[PDB]
């Protein structure tokens, strides 16, 4: 399979003499392996995955100093954005960053990522070339012009192609099997008779990891999007997920309708019907 | 390995 | 704008009256990151409620899992009350064991 690393960073401000809160989360293959929160008694990068315990004290000291660097960078940028958007003082403002790299199954670099958002809206992004920026707003165009004069894209391209990739190789070796877990779903259909001669058939997938799953209902071979209801996939709290998808059907006809569960941990998709 | 945005501020 | 939070309330394990279980309240797609989440047994606040750390999605919106131990019964109601800047008044979502 492919592989990914991302750092999700957030700075949130508060009216007053107090400095914004800064939070940084690392992910390898979409799992959180490190975190830094400036609200902690002793702000530091800490391991969120067991294999990161292999890292030595020097690693943690270096990465913590970087985080305090980002913390300062974010407070400056927050102040400037208050200027750009002509916002007065005393609002709630959030600035966020996503950066990282996508590798293919050959562990070779597929894509670099850098993006920024202000108030939860796209602000500026590095293009997949890694030499140019898309700036959404008019305020962002100022930032773009300023970053073209400052050679920002060269800086981040060196990071995303070199260090991101090589450190991701290290973490991929060390988290080797752990990052590759899969837990197959367990599916079952529950029967909910309803007014006017019908029944709700609800199709459940439980205890699966990762969270990607697809559930389809099929009448006589055709997939049914008509009057099909579902919930967004939800964490159980144990490290697995849940989902259900339901279809309103005529009572007595249940065996005419079929649920199918598509998940990577399965040998083949699950096909199931309501069983009395 | 986390990011350094160095001197390029928004 | 602000984004209106989505709320699901559900048990970790299949509900069984009288059997101890875990109740979840999953709140997603809200911005700004500050939010208030309470879990209620019979309209009263449950004392010790565990809360996952601040995380956000590729669409920049934030999500949280709150959870607590509970034993479902026929007479007891459970719900999640959520206060956020995006909504005029607090929203309460009651647990439905079928969903």
Looking at chain A, which runs of residues are DSSP E strands?
Answer: 3-12, 21-28, 31-37, 45-47, 94-103, 109-118, 121-126, 133-135, 186-194, 198-208, 214-219, 222-223, 228-230, 234-235, 241-250, 257-262, 270-272
Closest residue on chain B to A166 (Cα): B1
On whether the CB atoms of residues A222 and A198 are closer than 8 A, the answer is no
E strands along chain C, which residues?
6-11, 21-30, 36-41, 44-45, 50-51, 55-56, 62-70, 78-83, 91-94
Experimental method: X-ray
Q: How far is A236 from chain C (nearest CA, A)?
A: 5
What is the tally of structural domains in chain C?
1
Q: Among partner residues A63, A150, A163, which is closest to B8 by beta-carbon distance?
A: A150
Domain span at residue A25 reads 1-181
Give the integer Cα–Cα distance in Å for A49 and A63. Answer: 16
> The tokens 């800490």 sit on which residue?
A46
Answer yes or no: do A51 and A146 share one domain: yes
- Residues of B with Cβ-Cβ distance to A80 under 8 angstroms: 9-10
Do both A17 and A124 map to the same domain? yes
Chain A residues contacting B via beta carbons under 8 Å? 7, 9, 24, 26, 34, 36, 45, 63, 66-67, 69-70, 73, 76-77, 80-81, 84, 95, 97, 99, 116, 118, 123-124, 143, 146-147, 150, 152, 155, 159, 163-164, 167
Name the minimum distance, in Å, from the CA of C31 to any CA of chain A. 7
Let me know whether A177 and A196 are in one domain: no
A234 and A177, same domain (yes or no): no
Taking a C-beta distance cutoff of 8 angstroms, is the pair C92, C10 a contact?
no
Residue A10's beta-bridge partner residues?
Answer: A23, A96
Return the structure tokens found at A140.
Answer: 């962002």
Same domain, residue pair A57 and A106: yes
Domain tally for chain A? Answer: 2
Instruction: Look up the CATH number of the domain holding residue A131.
Output: 3.30.500.10
Final residue before a domain boundary, out of A181, A206, A221: A181
Q: What is the C-alpha separation between A31 and A110, in angstroms, rounded?
A: 19
Q: Give me the residues of C, 18-77, that contact A with CB < 8 A.
A: 22, 24, 26, 28, 31-34, 53-56, 58, 60-61, 65, 67
Residues A177 and A187 occupy one common structural domain: no
Q: Which residues of A touch B4 (CB under 8 A)?
A: 66, 69-70, 159
Are A117 and A223 in a shared domain? Answer: no
Q: Which residues of C29-68 are buried (b: 16+ CB within 10 A; e: fewer)?
A: bbbbbbbebbbbbeeeebeebeeeebbbeeebbbbbbbbb
Task: Count CB-CB contacts under 10 A for residue A178.
Answer: 14
- A22 backbone dihedrals φ, ψ, rounded to 5°: -120, 130
Q: What contacts A27, CB < 8 A, 6 or more positions away?
A: A4, A5, A6, A7, A8, A33, A100
- A touches C (3+ CB pairs < 8 Å)? yes
Same domain, A65 and A13: yes
Which own/partner pairs from A253-258 qualify as long-range (CB within 8 Å, at least 24 positions apart)?
A254/A191, A254/A199, A254/A201, A256/A219, A256/A220, A257/A201, A257/A217, A257/A218, A257/A219, A257/A224, A258/A217, A258/A218
Same domain, A42 and A154: yes
Query: Rounded to a whole number, what is the distance in Å from the CA of B10 to chain A's nearest CA?
Result: 5
Same domain? For A166 and A187 the reply is: no
| Cβ <8 Å between C67 and A8 | no
Which run of H or E residues covers position A147?
A: helix A138-149
Residue A172 and residue A189 in one domain: no
Q: Is residue A142 within a helix (H) or strand (E), and if so which, with residue range?
A: helix A138-149
SS (H, E, C) A62-87: HHHHHHHHHHHHHHHHHHHHHHHCCC
Q: Assign residue C12 the CATH number of its domain.
A: 2.60.40.10
Q: Resolution limit in angstroms?
A: 2.4
Contact A63, A34 (CB under 8 A): yes
Residue finishing a domain among A132, A162, A181? A181
- Shared-domain flag, residues A90 and A175: yes
The domain containing residue C44 runs over which residues?
1-99
Q: Which residues contact A69 (CB under 8 A, 6 or more apart)?
A: B4, B5
Token pair of C63, please? 């999500």
| CB contact set of A160 (below 8 Å; sequence gap of 6+) | A99, A100, A101, A112, A113, A114, A130
């Amino acid at each position: 399979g492919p592989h990914s690393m991302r750092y999700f960073e957030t700075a949130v401000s508060r009216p007053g003499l107090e400095e914004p809160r800064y939070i940084s989360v690392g992910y390898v293959d979409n799992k959180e392996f490190v975190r830094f929160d400036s609200d902690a008694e002793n702000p530091r990068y800490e391991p969120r995955a067991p294999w990161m315990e292999q890292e030595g004290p020097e690693y943690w000291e270096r990465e913590t100093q970087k985080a305090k660097g980002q913390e300062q960078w974010f407070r400056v940028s927050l102040r400037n954005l208050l200027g750009y958007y002509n916002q007065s003082a005393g609002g709630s403002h959030t600035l966020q960053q996503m950066s990282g790299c996508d590798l293919g199954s050959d562990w070779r670099l597929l894509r670099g990522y850098l993006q920024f958002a202000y108030e939860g809206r796209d602000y500026i992004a590095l293009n997949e070339d890694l030499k140019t920026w898309t700036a959404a707003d008019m305020a962002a165009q100022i930032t773009r012009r300023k970053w073209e004069q400052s050679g920002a894209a060269e800086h981040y391209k060196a990071y995303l192609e070199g260090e991101c990739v090589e450190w991701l190789h290290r973490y991929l070796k060390n988290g080797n099997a752990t990052l590759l877990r899969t837990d197959s779903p367990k599916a079952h259909v529950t029967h909910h008779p309803r007014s006017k001669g019908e029944v709700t058939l609800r199709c459940w997938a439980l205890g699966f990891y990762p969270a990607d799953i697809t559930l389809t209902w099929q009448l006589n071979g055709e997939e049914l999007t008509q009057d099909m209801e579902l919930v967004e996939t939800r964490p159980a709290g144990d490290g697995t997920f849940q989902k259900w998808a339901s279809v309103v059907v005529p009572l007595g006809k249940e065996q005419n309708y079929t649920c199918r569960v598509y998940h990577e941990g399965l040998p083949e998709p699950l096909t199931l019907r309501w069983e009395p | 390995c986390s990011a350094n945005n160095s001197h390029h501020y928004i | 704008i602000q984004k209106t939070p989505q709320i699901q309330v559900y048990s970790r394990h299949p509900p069984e009256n009288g059997k101890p279980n875990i109740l979840n309240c999953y709140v997603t797609q809200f911005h700004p990151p500050h939010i208030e989440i309470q879990m209620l047994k019979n309209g009263k606040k449950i004392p010790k409620v565990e809360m996952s750390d601040m995380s956000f999605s590729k669409d920049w919106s934030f999500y949280i899992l709150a959870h607590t131990e509970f034993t479902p019964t026929e007479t007891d109601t459970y719900a999640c009350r959520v206060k956020h800047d995006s909504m005029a008044e607090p929203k309460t979502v009651y647990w439905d064991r079928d969903m």
